[PDB]
Amino acid sequence: KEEAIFRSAEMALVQFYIPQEISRDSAYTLGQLGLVQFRDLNSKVRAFQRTFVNEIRRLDNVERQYRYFYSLLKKHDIKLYEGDTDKYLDGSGELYVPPSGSVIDDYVRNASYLEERLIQMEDATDQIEVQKNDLEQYRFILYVTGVIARDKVATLEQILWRVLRGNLFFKTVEIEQPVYDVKTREYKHKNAFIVFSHGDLIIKRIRKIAESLDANLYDVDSSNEGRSQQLAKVNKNLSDLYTVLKTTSTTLESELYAIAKELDSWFQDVTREKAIFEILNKSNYDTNRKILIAEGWIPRDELATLQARLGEMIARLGIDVPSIIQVLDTNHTPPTFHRTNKFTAGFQSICDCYGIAQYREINAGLPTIVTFPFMFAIMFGDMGHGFLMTLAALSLVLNEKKINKMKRGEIFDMAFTGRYIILLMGVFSMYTGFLYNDIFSKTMTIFKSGWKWPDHWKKGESITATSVGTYPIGLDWAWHGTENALLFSNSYKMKLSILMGFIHMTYSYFFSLANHLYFNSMIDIIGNFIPGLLFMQGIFGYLSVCIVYKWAVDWVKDGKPAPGLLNMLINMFLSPGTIDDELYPHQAKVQVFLLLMALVCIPWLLLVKPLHGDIMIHQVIHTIEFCLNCVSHTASYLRLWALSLAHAQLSSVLWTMTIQIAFGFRGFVGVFMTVALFAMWFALTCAVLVLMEGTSAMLHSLRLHWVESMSKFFVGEGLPYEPFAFEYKDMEVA
Amino acid sequence: SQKNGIATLLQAEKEAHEIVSKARKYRQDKLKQAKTDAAKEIDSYKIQKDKELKEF
Amino acid sequence: PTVQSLSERKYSDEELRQDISNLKEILENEYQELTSFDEYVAELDSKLLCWSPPHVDNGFWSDNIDEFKKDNYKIFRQLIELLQAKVRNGDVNAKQEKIIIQVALNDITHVVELLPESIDVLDKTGGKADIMELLNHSDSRVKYEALKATQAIIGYTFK
Give the HSE-up count for residue A69: Cα atoms under 13 Å, Cβ half-sphere. Answer: 30
Rounded Cα distance, C6 and C17, in Å: 9
Q: Minimal Cα distance from B20: which residue of A? A: A288
Give the HSE-up count for residue C159: Cα atoms under 13 Å, Cβ half-sphere. Answer: 11
What is the CA C95 to chain-centroid distance, rounded?
16
Q: Are A436 and A474 in contact (CB under 8 A)?
A: yes
> Alpha-carbon dihedral of residues C27, C29, C34, C37, nearest 10 degrees?
-150
Rounded Cα distance, A601 and A599, in Å: 5
Q: Are A584 and A549 in contact (CB under 8 A)?
A: yes
| CATH classification (class only), C38-157 | mainly alpha
Name the residue among A241, A117, A128, A134 with its Cα closest to residue C135.
A241
Q: Do A244 and C157 touch (CB under 8 A)?
A: no
DSSP labels, A624-677: HHHHHHHHHHHHHTHHHHHHHHHHHHHHHHHHHHHS---TTTT-HHHHHHHHHH
Rounded Cα distance, A475 and A463, in Å: 19
Among C144, C151, C157, beta carbon nearest to A237 = C157
Q: Are A241 and A135 in contact (CB under 8 A)?
A: yes
Rounded Cα distance, A97 and A202, in Å: 78
What is the CA A719 to chain-centroid distance, rounded?
21
Find chain A residues with C-beta within 8 A of B2's C-beta. 15, 326-329
Rounded Cα distance, C51 and C56, in Å: 9
Burial status of residue C57 (CB atoms within 10 A of its CB: 0-12, 13-18, 19 or more):
buried
Experimental method: cryo-EM
Residue A544: C-alpha distances to residues A81, A126, A494, A601 (Å): 65, 84, 12, 20
Among C12, C151, C157, beta carbon nearest to A248 = C151
Name the residue among C117, C79, C70 with its Cα closest to residue C101.
C79
Helix (H, G, I), strand (E, B) or coil at B27: helix
Strands A186-188 and A191-195: unpaired
Q: Under 8 Å CB-to-CB from A308, ≥6 apart: which residues?
A: none
Burial status of residue A380 (CB atoms within 10 A of its CB: 0-12, 13-18, 19 or more):
buried
For chain C, which residues lie within 8 Å of any Cβ of chain A, measuring from their own Cβ? 1, 5, 8, 10, 12, 14, 128, 132, 135, 143-144, 147-148, 150-152, 154-155, 157-158
Q: Are A486 and A652 in contact (CB under 8 A)?
A: no
Among A58, A120, A240, beta carbon nearest to C132 = A240
Q: Are A359 and A333 in contact (CB under 8 A)?
A: yes
In the beta sheet, which residues pair with residue A17? A293, A324
Name the residue among A402, A434, A433, A440 with its Cα closest to residue A419.
A402
Q: Are A408 and A457 in contact (CB under 8 A)?
A: no
Among A21, A244, A290, beta carbon nearest to C150 = A244
Q: Do B5 and A329 touch (CB under 8 A)?
A: no
Strands A292-299 and A170-174: unpaired
First to last CA, chain A: 43
Which candidate in A247, A254, A290 is best for mutational testing of the C interface (most C CBs within 10 A)? A247
DSSP labels, A109-132: HHHHHHHHHHHHHHHHHHHHHHHH
SS3 labels along A485-543? HHHHHHHHHHHHHHHHHHHHHHHHHHHHHHHHHHCCCCHHHHHHHHHHHHHHHHHHHHH
Q: Is A293 on the interface with B (CB under 8 A)?
A: yes
Give the resolution in Å: 3.8
Rounded Cα distance, C35 and C60, in Å: 8
